[model samples]
Target: NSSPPAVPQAFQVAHLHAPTGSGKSTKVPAAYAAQGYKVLVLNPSVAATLGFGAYMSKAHGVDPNIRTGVRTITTGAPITYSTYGKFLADGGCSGGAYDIIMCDECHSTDSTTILGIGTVLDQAETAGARLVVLATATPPGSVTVPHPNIEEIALSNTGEIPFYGKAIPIETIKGGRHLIFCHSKKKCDELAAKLSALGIHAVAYYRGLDVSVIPASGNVVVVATDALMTGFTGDFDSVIDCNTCVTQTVDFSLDPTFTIETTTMPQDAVSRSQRRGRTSRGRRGIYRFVTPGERPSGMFDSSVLCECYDAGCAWYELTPAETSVRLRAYLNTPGLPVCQDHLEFWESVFTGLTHIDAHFLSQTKQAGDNFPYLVAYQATVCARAQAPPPSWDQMWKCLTRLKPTLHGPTPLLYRLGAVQNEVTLTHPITKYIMACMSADLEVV
Candidate 1:
């Protein structure tokens, strides 16, 4: 006479802590597939993208090895198509979907736009598949992308799992002199003049002058709004972002922010494995740059000074645009079912936001509709999946609060908007928010 076992509540999304390179996505999905669950995986990178393709391949194939990693281009596995999307759609088979979708490289997700592996979560949900996002210990900002079911596994400082790769301590590079760059020419020129007056070798790089002028010597710092890494490399020792822009200021630089007595190793540089062209994938490492008697003012970029800038003012965001572009290719991928729908839906919601006036709405629309999403998506992503319709208003408030502080030219803003818009559209409450914001007038 056993009564029905206690039914579990809605799925609980929790963060996980695992060592790097442990094959978390690959191994986990493989195991689940073995469990007879129809799996759909959405891997974030090609190195790991096979978690999805492999699962699908195995589910339909009698050959067990067919469900493993992709063929090496070096020898080239005779598989009809080597790419992930091709295998899912037309590699020796017609287009198909998965039962369990696993996405690798999910850490690169930004809440503001649908452009990234983030859009796949909704696609899996709509298709009635279990959605799993695997990522490294990245910033916990994306909880807002609106997965009806969500879980995070942050492999940071927690020794819960011993699967992470070995650590490479950042070698310290020291200097005290400084140079700064600003996104806008006016701002860069003004800051350079100001720093030079203070006896710092602050020359405005905005004008495209010789780098030889600033002789590398005692305690040097270079700040610019433009990408300074163009056609240059060497013993500048370390690079620190003072993060003093028109919008919100970085706390570390503002509190008389100075150099940190730590080191930063360049990412995506030539690794030992690449030297041999071996199969060993490069590892992601963290660099700690703690200047003498200086801790970063804000939680992010410990090198930044911790003073808050004017709230209403615009602040320049120094971003890795190249990386963002790479990330965009993955997000806006055509094979991903949810990408376009997410953007269209959120852009409409951004238009319908009633609490904000048409003038501001006009601004966001002209600015590419993703503006409100970038500023607001984080809050919505954090609320419990399928919580209620009321959550959208709270998220909108959060976006409104952060609106004045965002600063980027078109590209950066475009990426942010894309991420933000897609994330907002994922929320259950998004439809309600849009309805509430709907207007009915063409009077000019």
Candidate 2:
């Protein structure tokens, strides 16, 4: 490292990969600001929440240019905050405008998000920007900075509570404060209600509600939807009541959700990383996720059983049904997995065939080779659908004796004591009889 002037001047595109609670949102930006590097942090609402204003209070910075009036920062100020939409709206992008263009939640790949980043990059090719930073705990596979001189800086979460975490149920965990994240607004209410009934001080936080007042008291347990996953951070335990928290809140969204999405997908990778980051932001804490018993059919393994997905303990209330399960119901059900549709298709074909024979060819085996009277019995006796033609009752015994002469190309005339009948064996029927002719009916 070369020692230069009081403030170093260099340009680079860096992906700042750091775990949650690493003070990435405020501290990192403030560090650049303190170095006298101009940093433009996108998403001013979040910048305001994490209180970047506090760090820049002396210079009256954290000046979020939200289209409307906000903080006023000089050109020499270390940080000048704004939003992605406004940044784009005001002829957005380039190194000329700011020394650093910091994309805080760079994991987002929405069209608007990409477009904004693209604008910055398209202009950066000829701009005065010293650095373009794609900062996120969960680095996105989608966010690609087209710059050639890009560098990656990874600062892992190694302290007691890293953002990379796993699920553990709520019952056994002991904590004064907890932030339970759910996937739905309704589930948030349900969890808060359930915990309140259990005599714990709990409340619901979701999209529409104002959470400013909720954090004022600190000890009230706040159950929120995953909407609070990014940008927002506060004192959990120390500053707010949400110290221990939950994840994959999407589990609570079962019938409560989905256009039918899969987990361990790209978006889930982003959210889980960010949400887990929240747990340790306040202080050292455990990232926990609790869910009800599993599904009868839709349950699946995401195959992401990494060290972060820790299952150190278990708490289950897997109650048995009053009646035994209708196992066959799966076959009859529609819109299930392809296996069910496949099973149902065959079952229906079988029931319809009930009116028909199980293949007349099958009787050849049941009678042993002595099914001697087959052609003659089927040809002469079965001429009429009804059976019991009594006169030829001895034909059963004749087949046992004449079993050897059963199949022949020529007509066979057999005398049954009082009567005589002549019959010619047909093609395939005679073929089957021809093979079994040598075998005795009495033995294998």
Candidate 3:
């Protein structure tokens, strides 16, 4: 005989509130399927990405009709596993095609994702299903669903279990399935290739890229973006997280076709902890960091080598070049991840500089904000991340030149591409840098 349902079978809507390492991934989902209920789970592709596509069948002998890709569509069986897009494409829950519908990671939707997930949530209203489960560690307040006033089950807390991992620097990657968290796709590729060059079977894993899971053997590695944080499986011996930030876009609209809107923002600690949680599940592991100029590889910042930019170092120097050099070094100090603020601030202080085709403007747009800076004066071309800033006289004329076309209560703009769109130069960090630059420039 079967035990009590993992969820109340009587309720038409409920939130399966739970944290990671709990059986909510399969154990809870399987409970109802065991009762011979027609169960439909959103996102087989996600489950496959997490390496748990077969978990339902492997655990409770309930093989699902699954399509891990658009090319692999199949009809329903004992349990149905369909992605958000495909499910919507195939009429979704509107037909009341199942006895139960379950969706995981309810809190994890932005403009692009909400298109599918939010659409599905709305369709659930028309489905008139017997049970609807919105499962998540953190529930969504953004997307509306019939989840209010429903029964709530307290989840299993693993507070009693010992924490299984410790943090390490990426410079010291102990081999054997290292899970390295890079900030961007290029970094993921760079790190993966670097590891592969060292003869480790390293591969970059991201949304469009399919990096299949191999059995736990040898020094295989995965360098990933935030994509691998949730729903992913595998007990890695270590997880290398570069402390760099990412810009998260959360545009919730009924139109679903609306363009994505974004500004520089850091992820909340909940999602940050979610990133941390990806390590050491069911096994011991280590948390690692990817910093600059380490073994895993990064652009070297040798400003510390220069006596002028030394921490707590001072100068009564009268040289214009020295002043500009210090200014250059100070700007490169780690601040916001996107260097957009840096470019805007430079335009403000130096005056008359257009960030046209400037490196940081475009680079910062993609890489989670905070990049580096630019110049026209030879004294201003502070592209020396590897060495001391060139003397003010030696910097890019991008520095001392009079490109200063001044006029802006309308506020200056920075371009991302030749003609894409523009970002207003007046940002909070821009002002902060303006103040800092004035101080650095005024004194010297």
Q: Would you estimate the TM-scores of all the predictions?
A: 0.33, 0.36, 0.40
Off by over 4 Å in 2: 1-82, 93-105, 108-112, 127-138, 141-179, 191-205, 209-222, 227-270, 273-286, 290-444
Candidate order (TM-score): 3, 2, 1
**Per-residue alpha-carbon lDDT of candidate 2 for residues 1-444, written as tens digits (9 for 90 to 100):** 011112225655556666545656566767776676766776524444335545455443454332312334444456666655455545566436677677655554332233345455555435677777766555433222222221212223332222223322334223466666655567678767766776667778888777573755435667786556366654453111122223221121211111112232222333434444555553554444322111222221211111001100000111111000111232222222112112222122122211212233233323433222222334233222222221345434323443443442222222222223333433333333233222323211
Top candidate by TM-score: 3
Candidate 3 local lDDT, residue 38: 72
- Give all candidate RMSDs, comma-separated: 18.6, 28.3, 19.2
The local distance difference test score of each candidate is 0.31, 0.40, 0.43
Residue 149 error, candidate 1, Å: 38
Lowest summed lDDT window (length 10), candidate 1: 305-314
What's the best-to-worst order under lDDT? 3, 2, 1
Instruction: Report lDDT (Cα) of residue 438, candidate 2.
Output: 24
- What's the distance in Å from true for residue 154, model 3? 33
Error of 2 at 50 (Å): 12
Candidates 2 and 3, the one with greater lDDT: 3
Evaluation by TM-score, superior candidate among 1 and 2? 2
